Design a protein around this ligand. Structure first.
Ligand SMILES: O=c1[nH]nc(Cl)c2ccccc12
Lengths: 20, 346
């Protein structure tokens, strides 16, 4: 399931802003 | 969405008065309105690139606040000087129910400080991940508040540029307050800075196209999707893979999404700027009048008269149970002034 794929991903924690 | 009657004139009136108030403070910013020693430091509520946010208690009043601490040398290294000046200049000038209020700002030899209202209910992020996903009525309740907040911000020529559940705090009434203006900017016309959070970036940002307030409305699309699905419309393990998904022009919806929700999201997550809701002739009214929002009473939302989905748990003042724990670190103040010229207007 898409939910299962999300939960197993590396980006379920707080996400940092980016800057270039 | 195209109609221009009495209702739309009441909005204009409100926004006109709002801009009057904002411009007075924008042109004459408040400065140096407290000192570090007036606050008892209690616990870290969150961290970012330049420093942390700490729960503090104001000694003279006993009020609790959330104090954002930025290390001037780190801000410089990350090339965020102008963005940090934007953040404080904008925050001390705005006034809206769903924006976290700046109470004091000041600086010392080492750091910059913005003392904000403490919002004890925690980040939406925490609640969302724990429960999995919000129902559409609950997502609608939160979304409506962001719609009004962007109508407000954009009318002042402000772009917010970092919408995400991490930056939305839930107050004791169960309503939202937007925090972190680190990328907020006052601009008429185009800007080009590559900034934001990968999952929430509009296509035009990723492709270095030059952009405007329409990026906030794309981000609203991402937020509503994530609230209702429990996961973002574009996710991967690495940002580059996320960007490829965002620019592809493809989006898939959970089968439980209502047809109205899917229609609204197809219009917000629109790669074509000439077609993206919030960016057309009708402006925000295309959003406010979309069928998904038919039950939303915009005035009642603003007045906080609508019953909230939930009220955060509250164990007395100073309780931080709704926030994660962070490694604590002592505030050091150098005996020499750092980066004085750079932050002189702060
Ligand atoms: O309670 C808060 N108020 N204001 C801010 Cl910026 C904040 C930022 C992170 C965590 C909590 C809070």
């Amino acid at each position: 399931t898409t939910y299962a794929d999300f939960i197993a991903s590396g980006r379920t924690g707080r996400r940092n802003a980016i800057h270039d | 969405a195209a109609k221009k009657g009495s209702e739309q004139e009441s909005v204009k009136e409100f926004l006109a008065k709002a801009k009057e108030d904002f411009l007075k403070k924008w042109e004459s910013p408040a400065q140096n309105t407290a000192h570090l020693d007036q606050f008892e430091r209690i616990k870290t509520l969150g961290t970012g690139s330049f420093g942390r946010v700490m729960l503090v208690k104001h000694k003279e009043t006993g009020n609790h606040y959330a104090m954002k601490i930025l290390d001037k040398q780190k801000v410089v290294k990350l090339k965020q000087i102008e963005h940090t000046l934007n953040e404080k200049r904008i925050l001390q000038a705005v006034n809206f129910p769903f924006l976290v209020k700046l109470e004091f700002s000041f600086k010392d030899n080492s750091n910059l400080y913005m003392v904000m209202e403490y919002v004890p209910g925690g980040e939406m992020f925490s609640h969302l991940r724990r429960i999995g996903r919000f129902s559409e009525p609950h997502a609608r309740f939160y979304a409506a508040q962001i719609v009004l907040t962007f109508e407000y911000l954009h009318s002042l020529d402000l772009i917010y540029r970092d919408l995400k559940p991490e930056n939305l705090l839930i107050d004791q009434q169960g309503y939202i307050q937007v925090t972190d203006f680190g990328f907020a900017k006052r601009v008429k016309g185009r800007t080009w800075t590559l900034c934001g959070t990968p999952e929430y970036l509009a296509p035009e940002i990723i492709l270095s196209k030059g952009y405007n307030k329409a990026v906030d409305w794309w981000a609203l699309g991402v937020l509503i999707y994530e609230m209702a699905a429990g996961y973002p419309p574009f996710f991967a393990d690495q940002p580059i893979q996320i960007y490829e998904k965002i620019v592809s022009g493809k989006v898939r919806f959970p089968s439980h999404f209502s047809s109205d929700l899917k229609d609204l999201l197809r219009n917000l997550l629109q790669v074509d700027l000439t077609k993206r809701f919030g960016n057309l002739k009708n402006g925000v009214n295309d959003i406010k009048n979309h069928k998904w929002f038919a039950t939303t009473d915009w005035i009642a939302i603003y007045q906080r008269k609508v019953e909230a989905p939930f009220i955060p748990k509250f164990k007395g003042p100073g309780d931080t149970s709704n926030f994660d724990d962070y490694e604590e670190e002592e505030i050091r103040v150098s005996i020499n002034e750092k980066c004085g010229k750079e932050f002189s207007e702060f």
